[PDB]
Enzyme design. Structure first.
Site, short mmCIF file in Angstrom:
data_model
loop_
_atom_site.label_atom_id
_atom_site.label_comp_id
_atom_site.label_asym_id
_atom_site.label_seq_id
_atom_site.Cartn_x
_atom_site.Cartn_y
_atom_site.Cartn_z
N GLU A 9 0.81 -1.20 0.00
CA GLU A 9 0.00 0.00 0.00
C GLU A 9 0.85 1.26 0.00
O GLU A 9 0.32 2.34 -0.31
CB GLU A 9 -0.93 0.02 1.22
CG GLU A 9 -1.81 -1.21 1.34
CD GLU A 9 -3.17 -1.02 0.66
OE1 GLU A 9 -3.92 -2.03 0.53
OE2 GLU A 9 -3.49 0.12 0.27
N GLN A 19 10.14 -17.18 -11.26
CA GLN A 19 11.49 -17.69 -11.44
C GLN A 19 11.58 -18.85 -12.42
O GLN A 19 12.69 -19.28 -12.74
CB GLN A 19 12.05 -18.12 -10.09
CG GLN A 19 11.34 -19.34 -9.51
CD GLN A 19 11.85 -19.70 -8.14
OE1 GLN A 19 11.43 -19.12 -7.15
NE2 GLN A 19 12.73 -20.66 -8.08
N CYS A 25 15.39 -18.60 -6.39
CA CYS A 25 14.54 -17.90 -5.44
C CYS A 25 15.30 -16.83 -4.65
O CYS A 25 14.75 -15.74 -4.39
CB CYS A 25 13.93 -18.91 -4.46
SG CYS A 25 15.16 -19.85 -3.52
N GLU A 50 17.05 -9.96 -11.66
CA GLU A 50 17.47 -11.22 -11.07
C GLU A 50 18.53 -11.91 -11.90
O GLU A 50 19.36 -12.61 -11.35
CB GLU A 50 16.27 -12.15 -10.90
CG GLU A 50 15.27 -11.68 -9.90
CD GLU A 50 14.35 -10.62 -10.49
OE1 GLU A 50 13.70 -9.90 -9.70
OE2 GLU A 50 14.28 -10.53 -11.76
N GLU A 92 15.98 -14.77 -17.86
CA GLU A 92 15.93 -15.87 -18.81
C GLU A 92 15.82 -17.24 -18.16
O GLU A 92 15.67 -18.24 -18.89
CB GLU A 92 17.17 -15.84 -19.71
CG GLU A 92 17.52 -14.46 -20.27
CD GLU A 92 16.65 -14.08 -21.46
OE1 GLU A 92 16.92 -13.04 -22.10
OE2 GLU A 92 15.67 -14.82 -21.75
N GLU A 96 23.87 -17.82 -17.39
CA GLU A 96 24.76 -17.51 -18.51
C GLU A 96 25.89 -16.62 -17.99
O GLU A 96 25.94 -16.28 -16.81
CB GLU A 96 24.01 -16.85 -19.67
CG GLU A 96 23.12 -17.81 -20.47
CD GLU A 96 21.67 -17.34 -20.58
OE1 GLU A 96 21.06 -17.57 -21.64
OE2 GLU A 96 21.15 -16.75 -19.60
N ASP A 114 21.56 -8.57 9.15
CA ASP A 114 20.91 -9.82 9.53
C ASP A 114 20.09 -9.58 10.79
O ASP A 114 20.61 -9.05 11.78
CB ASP A 114 21.91 -10.93 9.78
CG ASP A 114 22.50 -11.50 8.48
OD1 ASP A 114 21.93 -11.24 7.41
OD2 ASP A 114 23.55 -12.19 8.54
N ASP A 137 10.96 -23.09 4.81
CA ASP A 137 10.83 -24.47 4.37
C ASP A 137 9.56 -24.58 3.53
O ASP A 137 8.44 -24.59 4.06
CB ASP A 137 10.79 -25.42 5.56
CG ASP A 137 10.45 -26.84 5.16
OD1 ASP A 137 10.63 -27.19 3.96
OD2 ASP A 137 10.00 -27.62 6.04
N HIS A 140 6.75 -28.89 0.70
CA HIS A 140 5.59 -29.71 1.06
C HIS A 140 4.50 -29.47 0.04
O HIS A 140 4.33 -28.36 -0.45
CB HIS A 140 5.09 -29.37 2.46
CG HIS A 140 6.06 -29.74 3.54
ND1 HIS A 140 7.00 -28.85 4.03
CD2 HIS A 140 6.27 -30.90 4.18
CE1 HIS A 140 7.75 -29.46 4.94
NE2 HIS A 140 7.32 -30.71 5.04
N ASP A 160 15.64 -26.27 8.51
CA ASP A 160 15.97 -26.70 7.15
C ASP A 160 15.11 -25.90 6.18
O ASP A 160 14.03 -26.34 5.76
CB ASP A 160 15.76 -28.19 6.97
CG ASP A 160 16.68 -29.01 7.85
OD1 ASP A 160 17.61 -28.43 8.45
OD2 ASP A 160 16.47 -30.25 7.93
N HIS A 163 13.88 -22.15 0.48
CA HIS A 163 13.22 -21.26 -0.47
C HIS A 163 13.26 -19.83 0.05
O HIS A 163 12.77 -19.56 1.15
CB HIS A 163 11.78 -21.72 -0.69
CG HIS A 163 11.07 -20.99 -1.78
ND1 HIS A 163 11.56 -20.94 -3.07
CD2 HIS A 163 9.91 -20.31 -1.79
CE1 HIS A 163 10.74 -20.23 -3.82
NE2 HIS A 163 9.72 -19.84 -3.07
N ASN A 187 5.85 -14.56 -3.05
CA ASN A 187 6.58 -15.65 -3.65
C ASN A 187 6.99 -15.24 -5.07
O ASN A 187 6.64 -14.16 -5.56
CB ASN A 187 5.71 -16.91 -3.63
CG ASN A 187 6.51 -18.20 -3.75
OD1 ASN A 187 7.73 -18.22 -3.80
ND2 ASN A 187 5.78 -19.31 -3.83
C1 LIG Z 1 15.53 -21.59 -3.96
C2 LIG Z 1 14.49 -21.84 -5.05
O1 LIG Z 1 14.82 -21.60 -6.23
O2 LIG Z 1 13.36 -22.25 -4.71
C3 LIG Z 1 16.92 -22.13 -4.30
O3 LIG Z 1 16.90 -23.55 -4.36
C4 LIG Z 1 17.93 -21.65 -3.25
O4 LIG Z 1 18.69 -20.72 -3.50
N1 LIG Z 1 17.92 -22.29 -2.07
C5 LIG Z 1 18.85 -21.92 -1.02
C6 LIG Z 1 18.12 -21.71 0.31
C7 LIG Z 1 17.78 -20.26 0.63
C8 LIG Z 1 16.79 -20.21 1.78
C9 LIG Z 1 17.22 -19.55 -0.56
C10 LIG Z 1 19.94 -22.98 -0.87
O5 LIG Z 1 19.65 -24.11 -0.51
N2 LIG Z 1 21.22 -22.57 -1.15
C11 LIG Z 1 22.03 -21.84 -0.14
C12 LIG Z 1 23.51 -22.16 -0.27
C13 LIG Z 1 24.35 -21.33 0.68
C14 LIG Z 1 25.39 -22.13 1.45
N3 LIG Z 1 25.62 -21.58 2.78
C15 LIG Z 1 24.77 -21.69 3.79
N4 LIG Z 1 25.06 -21.12 4.95
N5 LIG Z 1 23.64 -22.36 3.65
#
Ligand SMILES: *[C@@H](C(=O)O)[C@H](O)C(=O)N[C@@H](CC(C)C)C(=O)NCCCCNC(N)=[NH2+]
Length: 220
Positions: A9, A19, A25, A50, A92, A96, A114, A137, A140, A160, A163, A187
């Protein structure tokens, strides 16, 4: 803090992007947060490239369509001294060689911040800074088929994450279970997914899907 925030807004947020079938992502999350902070600084909302990040931010630690991190993207923009616009360096959905051109740069940053790994800290950042890059995460089937309401997945992990997305606000709505708070998340799967491309993610439910575990934004 406010009970509800929505930066769309206030003009901080570009339309939902897609993407494609590239694991990029992290680059869409990063461009979203930097689009917000550039608008905060200049009053001008410009969609950012991007592809520039996918192709060029390897030396900061990113791996193109194989994954990356928003903080590494923010470092690239600082190290590189700029980032091209979406219109000048279009997406794209494949990695590349780097084609960055400083003449078409429209954004900069001087680092990143951070946020501490608590939903209370994420809330303060959203309320006062703008849209925030976050990791969740999303692995799912319930996330793929989400159409409306507050997304809650009992098997979601808070550690874990896989995304990168963009928190653009938060709010509440009454529900059957009285778990009524949500993060408003943009997203990068196009506007046919979810609610025009957005999802309301459960808020203040034990850091659901890790939304507060890797949150950050660029310093402009
Ligand atoms: C995300 C997507 O396209 O859906 C893509 O797989 C991605 O970049 N995933 C990341 C996770 C982040 C939350 C985006 C990923 O798994 N890569 C991170 C690598 C970095 C290595 N270092 C650490 N500290 N993880």
């Amino acid at each position: 803090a406010p009970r509800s925030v929505d930066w769309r807004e206030k003009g901080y947020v570009t339309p939902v992007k897609n993407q494609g079938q590239c694991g990029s992502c992290w680059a869409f999350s990063a461009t979203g947060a930097l689009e917000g902070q550039m608008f905060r600084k200049t009053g001008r909302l410009i969609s950012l490239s991007e592809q520039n990040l996918v192709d060029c931010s390897g030396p900061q630690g990113n791996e193109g369509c194989n994954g990356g991190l928003m903080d590494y993207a923010f470092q690239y923009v600082q190290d590189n001294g700029g980032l091209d616009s979406e219109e000048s360096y279009p997406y794209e959905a494949t990695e590349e060689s780097c084609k960055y051109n400083p003449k078409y740069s429209v954004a900069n940053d001087a680092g990143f911040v951070d946020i501490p790994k608590q939903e209370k800290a994420l809330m303060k950042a959203v309320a006062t800074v703008g849209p925030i890059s976050v990791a969740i995460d999303a692995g799912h089937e319930s996330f793929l088929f989400y159409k409306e309401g507050i997304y809650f997945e009992p098997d979601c992990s808070s550690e874990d994450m896989d995304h990168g997305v963009l928190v653009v606000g938060y709010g509440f709505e009454s529900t059957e279970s009285d778990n009524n708070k949500y993060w408003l998340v943009k997203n990068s799967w196009g506007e046919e997914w979810g609610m025009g491309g957005y999802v309301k993610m459960a808020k203040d439910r034990r850091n659901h899907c890790g939304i507060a575990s890797a949150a950050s934004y660029p310093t402009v």
